[PDB]
C-alpha cells in the first residue's frame, strides 16, 4: 504494498532522523520552576556545541506585580548570598529562587560528554568557600552520562533529561552539549573546520515565562515536540 502507507512511513522517518544531519540542531530547554508553580524556560540550539549559559540574575523569578524587575534589583538580592551583609535585606529571597531545574536535551548529542555545571551566584565554581584561585570549568561531576533519564521522543530515539532540586540559594548555569561523532569522523579535522566554526553560536535564544506548568506543557512542550515529565511522572 500500500503506497499510501509507504508514503506515511517515509514521512515519519524523515522527521525522526532529521536531527542526525550535518547542520541539524541539537536542542536544549532548561526549565526553572518556582515555589508558586510559575515556570521560566530558556531555549538554546546548535549543531555542533550548545553553550547554555545563564546568569544568576536571569534565573530569578523576575516579575513583580505584572512588571519585569531590573538586573540591578535582582543582583542586589543575590549579593547577600555571595558576600555576607552586602545588601540591606532583612529576609531571604527564597520566593524568587527556583525550587527545581529540569534540563531537556533532544538530538544527536554526545551523551558521554554533555556537561551540566551548577555554579555559584557570581559565576564561580561552586564550593563551600568560592574563590578566584579555585575556579575552573567542566568538573568531573558535571558529566552526567548514564544519570540522564530517557524520555519518549516519538520516533527519534533522542531525548533525555536531568533534574536537580536546589537548596534556597541562587545559582548560575553552564551547559555544554557537544555533537555525537562516534561514527568515527572528526568534524574539526581538515578543511571542514572553518565551516564548523562559522556555525557556532548562530541560533537566537528564547526565554519564556509561564504562570503554571500546564501552560508550559500546552504552549511550549506540545507545540514544538519536546516531551516533559511532571511531578507525578506523567509525560506531556
Amino acid at each position: 504494498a500500500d503506497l499510501s502507507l509507504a508514503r506515511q512511513r517515509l514521512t515519519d522517518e524523515s522527521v525522526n532522523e532529521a536531527p542526525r544531519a550535518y547542520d541539524a540542531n541539537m536542542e536544549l530547554v532548561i526549565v526553572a520552576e518556582y515555589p508558586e508553580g510559575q515556570c521560566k524556560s530558556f531555549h538554546f540550539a546548535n549543531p555542533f556545541v550548545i553553550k547554555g549559559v545563564i546568569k544568576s540574575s536571569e534565573l530569578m523569578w523576575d516579575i513583580d506585580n505584572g512588571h519585569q524587575m531590573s538586573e540591578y534589583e535582582l543582583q542586589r538580592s543575590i549579593n547577600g548570598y555571595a558576600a555576607s551583609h552586602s545588601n540591606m535585606r532583612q529576609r531571604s529571597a527564597i520566593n524568587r529562587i527556583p525550587k527545581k531545574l529540569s534540563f531537556y536535551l533532544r538530538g544527536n548529542v554526545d551523551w558521554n560528554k554533555a556537561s551540566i555545571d551548577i555554579r555559584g551566584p557570581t559565576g564561580l565554581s561552586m564550593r563551600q568557600t568560592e574563590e578566584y584561585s579555585l575556579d575552573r570549568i567542566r568538573p568531573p561531576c558535571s558529566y552526567k552520562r548514564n544519570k540522564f533519564v530517557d524520555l519518549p521522543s516519538c520516533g527519534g530515539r533522542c531525548e533525555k533529561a536531568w533534574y536537580v532540586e536546589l537548596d534556597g540559594r541562587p545559582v548560575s548555569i553552564a551547559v555544554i552539549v557537544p555533537r555525537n561523532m562516534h561514527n568515527g569522523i572528526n568534524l574539526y579535522a581538515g578543511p571542514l573546520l572553518g565551516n564548523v566554526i562559522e556555525g557556532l553560536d548562530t541560533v537566537p535564544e528564547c526565554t519564556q515565562w509561564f504562570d503554571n506548568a500546564p501552560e508550559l506543557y500546552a504552549y511550549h512542550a506540545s507545540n514544538y515536540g519536546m516531551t516533559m515529565l511532571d511531578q507525578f511522572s506523567v509525560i506531556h
Copy 2:
C-alpha cells in the same frame, strides 16, 4: 607630477583598501523599519565571521510613550503568533512588527557564502509547522549570492545589500558573514588558527533607535560611511 595630488591619491587608496587587511572588520548593519516610519538599527562587526543574531523580542518596536518595554511584555505578545491562544490579546501586534528589513554588508566578504536566515518567532527554522525535529542552520535559500544588490562604497568596491518585506508576523534573524579567502589561503590552517579564534566575537554590538529614516541617514549612514537606499531608490 603634482605631489599634493599624489598625496591625495595615496590617502584615498589607504582608506578604500583598508578593509582588505588582516584583522580589518567586515561590517553589518541591519535596519528594521516599522509602519509609522521609525527605524531600529543593529551593528555587528568582525574580521573573520560576523555572527548577527537577533531575538524576535529584540526586533519589535519596543518604545511605548517614551519608555522602553521589557522583554517580558514583548515576548508575551510574540507568544500568540507562536502558539495559538497562548496570551490574552484580542487584537494583533502588527504596529510593532517590522514592515521591512534591510541588510547592509560592507567589506572583504565572501559573497558566495554569506547567509541570511529569517527564522521563526522562537528561533526555529521557519516553515508552516515549526517543530524541534526539523530545526537546522544555513538552509540552501539563505545564501543570497547574486541576489545581493550592489551599492556605492565611495571607492571601496565593497558594499552590497539585501531587502525583504515581512508579512505581519514576528521573526528572528541569523546572519553569518564569512571573510573572503578566494586568494587561495586558508586562515584556519596551521598555527594562525589560534589567532583567528582569539579574534572571533570580540567587537561590541550597537543598537540605535530613530523616529524616522532621515535621522538614520543623517546621524548613522552619512556619519560613518554606510550607503543606504530609500523607497525611491535614492542613495544616502
Copy 3:
C-alpha cells in the same frame, strides 16, 4: 618534620598553583569608577581566551533615583557624542561617564598577547574621525605587555592590572586575554582542538553595582581574592 606544617604547605601550594591547570579559568575584573565615587564591576572568565566585551551603554552609570535606566535612554545620551546634534541634550552627560577604568587580570595569562582596546561610542576603532572603512581589531597599542602593573596575588605570582583615565567621552571596550602556552605546546593543534572550542565562552558573566569603592573592596575584592589598588596606592 612537622606534618601539620607540611599539610599547611601542601594546602597553600594547591591553592596557589591551581590556575595553571588545564580547564582552570583566567579571571578578568573591569572596574569603572564615576565622579561621585560609585563603581560598576564586570567579571569574565575562561581557560583559553577571555573575551571581555562591553557596550558603551553598559559602561554608563545607569541608576537614576534608585531605578535602572533603559538601554534606549542611555544610547540616546551617547548618540550626541557620536554624531553632532543627534539628540536633544542641552548639557553634557559627564555625570554618568567613568572617570577611570581599572582592569584586573589574574591567572595563567599570556602577558605578551593580552590586549585592551578602548573603542568608540558605537564600537568602532577609536580615532579623531571614526568611519566604517577604518575599523579593525587588535591595534598595536592595545598590547600592554610590560605596561601592566604587578600586584600581590598572595602566593599565585599571577595578578597584574592596567589603569586608564577617560576624558569625558563615552567609550566601549574589547579585552582579549589568551592563555599562556610558553611551555611549548599548542593546545589548538591536533585532536585537543575540539575540546578547547567546546570550552570557549561557557562561563556566566557578572555585573555588580557599588555606591563606593570600600563596598567594592569589602564585598567583591576581599570576598574572592582579587587584590585591588586605590587612589593612595594602598592594596585591598
